[model samples]
Target: GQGKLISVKTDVLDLTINTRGGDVEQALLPAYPKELNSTQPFQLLETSPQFIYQAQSGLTGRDGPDNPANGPRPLYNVEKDAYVLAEGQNELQVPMTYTDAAGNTFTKTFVLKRGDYAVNVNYNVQNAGEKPLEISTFGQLKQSITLPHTFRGAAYSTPDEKYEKYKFDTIADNENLNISSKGGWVAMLQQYFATAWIPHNDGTNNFYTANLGNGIAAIGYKSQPVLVQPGQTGAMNSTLWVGPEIQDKMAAVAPHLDLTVDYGWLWFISQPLFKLLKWIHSFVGNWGFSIIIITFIVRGIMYPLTKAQYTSMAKMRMLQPKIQAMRERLGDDKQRISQEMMALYKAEKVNPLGGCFPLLIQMPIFLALYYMLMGSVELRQAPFALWIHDLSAQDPYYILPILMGVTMFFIQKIMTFMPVIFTVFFLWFPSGLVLYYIVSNLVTIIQQ
Candidate 1:
């Protein structure tokens, strides 16, 4: 029940280091407010009873001090009670030390840098005994009850599957998620945020999920034990990322770390669209601006095929009567019907090219943008223009959705109550994605 708290601050990330259990007691992202029009930083990790979410990185095993059954925790002492990334500083390191009963000096340091969300957790164990001691370093994300939406739970990176999700139920229900891999990472991710413990790819690390009793579930990794000798300090290291799921930043910190973005098989197409959006956002600094042109670019590039595609469809209608006559003539021969259909089209100098081929290719881009807009934190609470505060939420005024419906009607002037059917779903979809479709419809309409 007793522990010391130290304030560690950087430009972007602010954290409270609690000596109780040697965990990151609370973490807040200063650049991101909890609400659309508030100054209060978003608290990603907290120790409150109602919603207790914290990252615990400690030394454990036969010889380490931070075990589950330590009465009230061994409070660590630091050179200063608090610290910050002082002005003109790019990095800050807060080291707290604790001496075990066996005289082992344990120094735990939290390393933070300016404008960065990835934090380093390092432990230096200076063995004070006659022989060497072996201890394991582990990192885990812990939180109390109440699971969130899909793509919003415990996930990890593995050798086989780059990314896999094991929702909190997998832990509460006793479905084990235990894996050993040299290349791996463990995280608690949601619609717009990621809290992950990433171990370096040096040795065998075991990723395990546990029901830590009392409505608490945890997913973490235990690095292979580092052997420490008397008077020699053995250093253990791991990185903790608690911030928005930006692909490049995550990828820069660790391999496959960007997989936490949670894009599906369309990652082949989605990844590029994401980069395209990222590039445009950086260039124009506006979300809708990026989405508009990205949609235009994709539709414009494929316009060549799309142009031939629809004109060919008009010919299909022109050939419909002749095809109907041939069907009647070859009523019992199915194979002959397709052959004659193609032969007639060739003579008419028209190639339907299966009419739907170009569209199949564009489906990948549409789906890719869907996953990014829905699950990405970058679009969370992002403002575009008047009355549109959050890009990744259903339109409050139904304006974008309504306008998209209008565009659909025009694209299909060419219409059939089909746009009305899809309008129902678009009304509930995130506005960022809805904007993409509106731009897409306009491009198609103009191209036609």
Candidate 2:
């Protein structure tokens, strides 16, 4: 795969296209820095100084010019090795030409637009041969050591199953990760960044993940064959979204691409939760403030329910003596004791399950918020009004978590050390999270 590199630059991306397979050998996003304030861009793909990560695309089939008989992959000929999306321009394309012995030329081009991360990789085949030639488009993301994008593995979507994850680590030679579907994409998911190959929507495409050897993991999709008869032409292509997995932007690229945000299991609820959070952040202009406002709104809605729970729970505690008497009388007979207590509780007009209603609701929301915050790029390095900076990372002072933990003490003292447990637990968690909890507990206390 020896080749020369074609450097292409856009407003958002700095890319390198290698002639070996017209592959994306290096891709960087200037919008996101390597660190919070560093000038260097965060690397998304590289055949690297440390390891290899690349986006490879080319044509392949029985009659494909890239087949092993001639070469595993053709070395493209380029007019220029550099490209720039000039000022006022809407699109930029760097084209590479690979011509065979018979002068059947294959042109590979990588296209980009202003301020966009989704790239169009296209191949135009002009067959000047005497016979027909059939070829299919194949696009792949290959990486070594770092499994998946962030070690989260690969994901693809089909009509029946909207989304599915591929186990990059467990792939074996005979297991065959090969699959065929009518419109799907394979993406490698990382923490913030991702890379995917999107084939055409209507045609059946083959999706596969296999070890490319030397500990490299490869996931991609190959499109159905297209024939170019003598003196005819055909086009084979796919799109690659090689950048941060911001949901709204990613969703605009292709179907099911937004699901890469990793909201985790309760996505049914988390997705909308993030939606509302973002909606609020739009006007507030600060993620820390938006999270605090959402906490207030959420706690306000839960107050009536929490009050009802506290009321019923208080009455149940009053009847504890009588319930204990029933237990003493029916000693060693838990079933009977439970039955009598159940009867007494109904007579007393108190439901013990009421004590858990508020909690059942609270836990899921809290967990969902974790996913929402973790996946949001808007929160990264964002500052609050006070000393707490970086809404996306842990508080340096641990003050907000400590304050929230104190509120846990006055609010029924639920399981005594829960305050102690979470105080320490959240000391290492993000400040936006701590801020939410402190405000949440304060409102609950005020409501009580």
Candidate 1: list runs displaced more than 4 Å.
Answer: 68-72, 79-81, 158-161, 200-202, 320-362, 411-415
Give Cα distance to truth, residue 195, candidate 2, Å. 0.6
Q: Which lDDT value does model 2 have at 297?
A: 83
Which one wins on TM-score?
Answer: 2
lDDT, candidate 2, 1-448, per-residue tens = 7868889999899998888888889999988778755889989897765688888888887677666766668888888888989998999988788888888988988889999999998889999989888888888888774533123667788776688887666653424477888877888877777899888634689888888787777888878887789998888768899898878888877888888877778578778867888899899888788888899888777767777767788888888898888878878788898887888877777676456576677778877887767766667677898886678777777787878788888886557667778888888777888888888888878766
TM-score of each: 0.87, 0.91
lDDT for each residue of candidate 1 in 1-448, tens digit (9 for 90 to 100): 3567878889899898887656888899998988877989998998885778889888876677776654335578877667878898899988888888779898988888889999998888898998888788889898875833236578888787687888787799988787898857899876678899987636789999999888788999987777888888888888999988888788878877777777766667777777888889997889888888887787778767776766788888888999889989989687898888888888777675475565587677667888878766778888888888898788888888788888877764433676776688788788888888888777767766
Q: Candidate 2: misplaced stretches above 4 Å?
A: 145-151, 172-174, 320-342, 353-358, 410-414
Cα error, residue 122 of model 1, in Å, equals 1.1
